[PDB]
Design a protein around this nucleic acid. Structure first.
Ligand SMILES: Nc1ccn([C@H]2C[C@H](O)[C@@H](COP(=O)(O)NP(=O)(O)OP(=O)(O)O)O2)c(=O)n1
Ligand SMILES: [Mg+2]
Ligand SMILES: [Mg+2]
Ligand code: NA
Ligand code: NA
Length: 426
DNA sequence: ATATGACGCT
DNA sequence: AGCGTCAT
């Protein structure tokens, strides 16, 4: 097919953790500010950056002391620390605020703490029927960009936006209820309403992409951040993809996308069209090969999954450098700190969402291993009891200690991770 | 010494 | 089941 069957939107909050802190603390609003984790080592690690601070070159992962060199007036909000660890509860609860608003408009797939996909196909059909072929006024799309427009025969971005939108709407054929471009346009009208409700009811601004599938919706979202939304039509794909680096497409940002560029000797998504589906399958596998063949034409069939809640609840802490855990008592104490946070999050989850986790995953990283995880083990999660969860976690990992002195722990542990999974309705 | 969470591979 | 990949 032509991959125009659905209307799919991705809504992503703008500098989300910063907005959460700026709502709470109005003295941070409209200023270069960032959210920082910990403090002692180089001022802490930055994990979110306001757009005023991005202009100075402040970025994620940057040390706060280094960010202050680029932006001396940078304001910092620190992530909460509980039981010796970062605690992200404030941001999870703000995320729930947003997701429950989005859910009023259509079923959502929670894709991260700050973004969800929406399938608007049904909602579009209903608005199209409630409207009666009445044209769509530009006033209904006050923050929408039409990628690829304006085009053809002034110098301010808002003026450009309106010129593109006018061109788009002037060419739209509303007599055809099945026109994909009309469907996208109605989808964008709905997303305007959804974004307005989010801002009114939470104070948070967001951006969105509207297209026919997840990949295009995600790409569109980022094209005019912040506080704007972008419609990427099927027709816009050839020009858009002709200069689009492969690594910008969701799932091609790692080794697979590197192999595509390396093996095929290309750089842009549109260059993939010159290969047969079998060719791509030969290099990258049947699944990936078929996916790439469709995707480079703007076609992708990954459905918006109805999932509003995370399906796992985890707690993790790294122990870098000299802080690596080297004694049994140290491992036990931190496993308990993690287990205690997990217990309170699990208890809250059960009351909120009428479900219980049944499996506990335990993962550690050993000193020197660059892998995210060095070993993973599981056991039953029978009761929401921190001491039992930490005791069981130690049982399943205690043989990894290659030390003739049992009071010590070698090799030193550089990460502990506890994750509750396999939820069942309760 | 750049805390999570979903899904793929075997 | 346990590890690998990619994401935010
Ligand atoms: N690698 C990352 C990316 C994001 N996050 C957190 C902080 C972000 O505010 C929040 C949302 O991630 P994000 O959407 O990728 N970036 P953010 O919303 O901060 O700025 P935008 O570029 O979306 O406007 O997740 C993180 O902790 N580690
Ligand atoms: Mg965001
Ligand atoms: Mg995001
Ligand atoms: Na509830
Ligand atoms: Na990402």
């Amino acid at each position: 097919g032509t991959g125009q069957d659905r209307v799919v939107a991705l809504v992503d909050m703008d500098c989300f953790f910063v907005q959460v802190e700026q709502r709470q603390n109005p003295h941070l609003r409209n200023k270069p500010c960032a959210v920082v984790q910990y403090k002692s080592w180089k001022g802490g690690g930055i994990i979110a950056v306001s757009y005023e601070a991005r202009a100075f070159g402040v970025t994620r992962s940057m040390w706060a002391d280094d960010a202050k060199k680029l932006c001396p007036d940078l304001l910092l909000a620190q992530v909460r620390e509980s039981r010796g660890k970062a605690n992200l509860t404030k941001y999870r609860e703000a995320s729930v605020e947003v997701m429950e608003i989005m859910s009023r408009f259509a079923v959502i797939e929670r894709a991260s703490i700050d973004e969800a996909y929406v399938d608007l196909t049904s909602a579009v059909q209903e608005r199209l029927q409630k409207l009666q072929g009445q044209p769509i006024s530009a006033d209904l799309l006050p923050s929408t960009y039409i990628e690829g427009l304006p085009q053809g025969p002034t110098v301010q971005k808002e003026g450009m936006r309106k010129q593109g939108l006018f061109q788009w709407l002037d060419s739209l054929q509303i007599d055809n209820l099945t026109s994909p471009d009309l469907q996208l346009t109605v989808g964008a009208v709905i997303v305007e309403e959804m974004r307005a409700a989010i801002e009114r009811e939470t104070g948070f601004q967001c951006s969105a992409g509207i297209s026919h599938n997840k990949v295009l919706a995600k790409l569109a979202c980022g094209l005019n951040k912040p506080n704007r939304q972008t419609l990427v039509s099927h027709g816009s794909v050839p020009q858009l993809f002709s200069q689009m680096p492969i690594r910008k497409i969701r799932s091609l940002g790692g080794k697979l996308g590197a192999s595509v560029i390396e093996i095929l000797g290309i750089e842009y998504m549109g260059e993939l069209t010159q290969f047969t589906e079998s060719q791509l399958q030969s290099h990258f596998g049947e699944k990936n090969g078929s996916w790439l063949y469709a995707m480079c034409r703007g076609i992708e069939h990954d459905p918006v999954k109805p999932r509003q809640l995370p399906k796992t609840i985890g707690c993790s802490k790294n122990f870098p450098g000299k802080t690596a855990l080297a004694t049994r008592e140290q491992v036990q104490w931190w496993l308990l700190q993690l287990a205690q946070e997990l217990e309170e999050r699990l208890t809250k989850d059960r009351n909120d969402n009428d479900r219980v986790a049944t499996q506990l995953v335990v993962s550690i990283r050993v000193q020197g291993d660059k892998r995210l995880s060095s070993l993973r083990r599981c056991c039953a999660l029978t009761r929401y009891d921190a001491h039992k969860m930490s005791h069981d976690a130690f049982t399943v990992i205690k043989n990894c200690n290659t030390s003739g002195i049992q009071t010590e722990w070698s090799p030193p542990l550089t990460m502990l991770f506890l994750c509750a999974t396999k939820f069942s309705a309760s």
